[PDB]
Design an enzyme around this catalytic site. Structure first.
Site, PDB file in Angstrom:
ATOM      1  N   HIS A  55      42.317  36.596  37.412  1.00  0.00           N
ATOM      2  CA  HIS A  55      41.444  36.700  38.290  1.00  0.00           C
ATOM      3  C   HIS A  55      40.615  37.969  38.748  1.00  0.00           C
ATOM      4  CE1 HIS A  55      44.732  38.591  40.391  1.00  0.00           C
ATOM      5  NE2 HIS A  55      43.715  39.538  41.276  1.00  0.00           N
ATOM      6  N   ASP A  82      39.256  39.869  42.009  1.00  0.00           N
ATOM      7  CA  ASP A  82      39.340  39.528  43.212  1.00  0.00           C
ATOM      8  C   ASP A  82      38.322  39.760  44.073  1.00  0.00           C
ATOM      9  OD1 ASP A  82      41.487  41.174  43.187  1.00  0.00           O
ATOM     10  OD2 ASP A  82      40.545  43.337  42.996  1.00  0.00           O
ATOM     11  N   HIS A 133      41.268  40.503  36.611  1.00  0.00           N
ATOM     12  CA  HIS A 133      42.967  41.462  36.319  1.00  0.00           C
ATOM     13  C   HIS A 133      44.032  40.302  35.809  1.00  0.00           C
ATOM     14  CE1 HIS A 133      41.745  42.169  40.702  1.00  0.00           C
ATOM     15  NE2 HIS A 133      43.322  42.664  40.416  1.00  0.00           N
TER      16      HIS A 133
HETATM   17 FE   LIG Z   1      44.198  41.220  42.529  1.00  0.00          FE
END
Ligand SMILES: [Fe+3]
Ligand SMILES: [Cl-]
Ligand SMILES: [Cl-]
Ligand SMILES: [Cl-]
Ligand SMILES: [Cl-]
Ligand SMILES: [Fe+3]
Ligand SMILES: [Fe+3]
Ligand SMILES: [Fe+3]
Lengths: 246, 241, 241, 246
Positions: C70, C72, C202
């Site tokens: 994903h 953030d 990440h």
């Molecule tokens: Fe994250």
């Protein structure tokens, strides 16, 4: 009474019958056998029919109960319908044909690896009054013993698979089920009546009549809870059983 | 001799060992077990190694014979058991290597996909025309562990059409290469990796801007897969290794 | 202050820096540039750091605000610009983290998929009901680089059905997380990573058998995406961060 | 001469015409317009037809040239056919229907992102005498100006995409093209003749007659090289142009 195949794996036309509540036992049984064998059957020229006579006929074959995606009816419920009887009331000037697929033929065309997959697979079917049922993906028909794939548009996922896997596998199965060799498409004329085995089919309405007026009358017959090839039954996660016509 | 896990499902570092052909039975055996348990093992600080000494070591463990995920030479029926790979010349950045445990991937399969894969055959090809129908689950001859057999040499599955095969292969590869099943090694001078080709896939990574990179690999003979039902791979075309 | 590439398309190690709030303009600027260029940067040997000192450092770079890939908080419209993440307690094995460059992934797209993605909108949701329609290509406000915007918060694409969305999202994710676009960091005590959330995804890795693991993250405010045609994300539901 | 729609997006029946080489200009043109508008048209009761008369008719509409997967005809060649005219000779006792899909309707149903994709996409079509052609995925019809998707079973991959991407995208496009709302399925009776615009359709034979005897006679009309929405033409990688009937 004659039964004429419409295609290799699905569909028959039944002639020499006037549908109603007055049919003798031999005739009702011939009709039942034709339904179970051909999965969807059609009667033409039934212009004497109205709602009440269609219902009187339906009562001879089962217990009556109370669109453009491929589906098996009401499979979000555990005891979903066995069959429906559908007559044309008002038809559009063009389009408006209906599709059925044989999920028995579909199972028969599966190669061994996909038989092993589907015989050991469970799908969550939902209506989203919250119905959620885990059905097996292979059902053993209670009257014929034939194995049929159980899937269609009410499937939201398979148990143990992630969302992407489920989306890909469902479509792989739908692609097989709805291969044209497994299907019949009926162009409705006034007086036509279709009856299909919902335990052995999927169907699909087609939106190709530019919303011209169209009216059909459907009576649906009560079915039972699926059993798979290992004798296991569907699991109710949420919701109530379907009920007979009040 | 110490064996240190690098991750839950794969990889260990073996320290206290000077690789070569003069290792005793006890040490060769501990190394064999570490390899079978951890699927890929790494030895650091092996600066004394050359091609000859690497080969002498290799001979203790078996009989000596990029950027897509694969199991080595699976277009052949008796494809390799293992490889031993030494860094010779390394780029100034990038150049890491990935391994996935196909045992771990099999263990993560839910019941429906076990029933699928245990009854599934893949055609593996090199396009010398090598074509082999391998089972998709192989039972490791030394550990008894079940491992997924797939990778980039797969061209299709028996009884499935091209689109079904493409979609299923990718589904299996997505599972196999989940990071929880993988170890990624950044090579330093003196590093040696050894992997069990019966329980893994690997993949080179093209992230060093074609700077010079030289590795030396020695590959050890393996046998023909056996599936969960005792069935063996079928040679369609080509010869044994 | 030295900046050392870890890979062709992503990652660098920054040495010669003691992180904190007393860094001069020149050093804060070199760090900003390294971050924008390399997408994720790592500082080692930062043993002097605590929560307070990490925050003092964070404030020089912006305004302070697991196991699926994903970007953030992309269910929000003005999702974060960057994060700064310190190891506090590390497991004895496993526990590495992965980053992918969504700039690199965009640059690898062939012409047809550029035309697709440059004209594509994704619904991102947290299921407080946050729903945002973001463009699938975002133009970085500081570098001008185009980056793919997708990841696990994506629920579907505007105008596509559920199956099309599932298949396309996975196609885009398969491209984004190709190992050539990624760096995987094995954490050692004293390590700090900082990434540009406008140019990356990440993913935490669950390969440490739930041994204790504690990290401290500080997240920096970002702005609303602009796409290649100048269009901004659309809040369907929820508030700004 | 009357033209009656069979469905919203595809298909028409043409009545009051006896097919042959003797039709006047007005009638040939009415037929041409009906073909281009409805994409596939059907004439019934043409029992006077034989091979020679069908050919004489075909010559009025174009230049004649010399099964169960969805396809556009001969798209592995650059100058693939414009149209075909197909009459039933011998029909099986059941099954044997034919499907057509409108690739114009399919393009019209694409949402903007998929328009941008397909308008900028190239497919390699092959017969594997080695024909390989890179066609655009959107073609601008040379007579109507309408945009039509170009894909089908001869596609082996898309330029710039890997094998898996190509497989997934082709099937996404096929799934859209062959949605039942875009299709007509014809149950053949003796004397029936179908004519379709191969620049605006795909079609598919159906293997649902248990290999009973079936014989159709096809005459195919020469087409031209596709042009896409940017004015770019198909690229011959390998193989020769199709040629007129010797
Ligand atoms: Fe994250
Ligand atoms: Cl009739
Ligand atoms: Cl159909
Ligand atoms: Cl990795
Ligand atoms: Cl008629
Ligand atoms: Fe229904
Ligand atoms: Fe290899
Ligand atoms: Fe054809």
């Amino acid at each position: 009474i004659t039964v004429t195949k419409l295609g290799s794996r699905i569909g028959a036309r039944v002639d020499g019958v006037r549908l109603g509540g007055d049919l003798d036992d031999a005739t009702v049984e011939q009709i039942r056998r034709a339904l179970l064998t051909h999965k969807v059957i059609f009667f033409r020229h039934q212009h004497h029919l109205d709602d009440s006579r269609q219902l009187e006929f339906a009562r001879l074959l089962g217990t009556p109960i109370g669109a453009t995606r491929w589906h098996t009816d009401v499979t979000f419920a555990a005891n979903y319908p066995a069959a429906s009887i559908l007559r044309a009331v008002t038809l559009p000037s063009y389009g408006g044909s209906t599709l059925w697929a044989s999920t028995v033929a579909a199972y028969q065309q599966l190669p061994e690896p996909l038989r092993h997959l589907t015989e050991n697979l469970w799908a969550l079917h939902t209506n989203r009054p919250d119905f959620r049922t885990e059905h097996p993906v292979v059902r053993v028909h209670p009257e014929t013993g034939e194995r049929a794939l159980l899937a269609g548009d009410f499937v939201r996922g398979f148990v143990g698979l992630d969302g992407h896997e489920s989306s890909v596998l469902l479509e792989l199965l739908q692609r097989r089920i709805t291969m044209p060799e497994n299907t019949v498409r009926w162009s409705w004329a006034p007086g036509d009546v279709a009856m299909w085995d919902n335990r052995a089919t999927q169907h699909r309405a087609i939106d190709d009549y530019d919303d011209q007026p169209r009216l059909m009358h459907r009576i649906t017959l009560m079915g039972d809870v699926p059993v798979n090839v290992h004798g296991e039954r569907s699991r109710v996660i949420s919701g109530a059983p379907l009920e007979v016509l009040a």
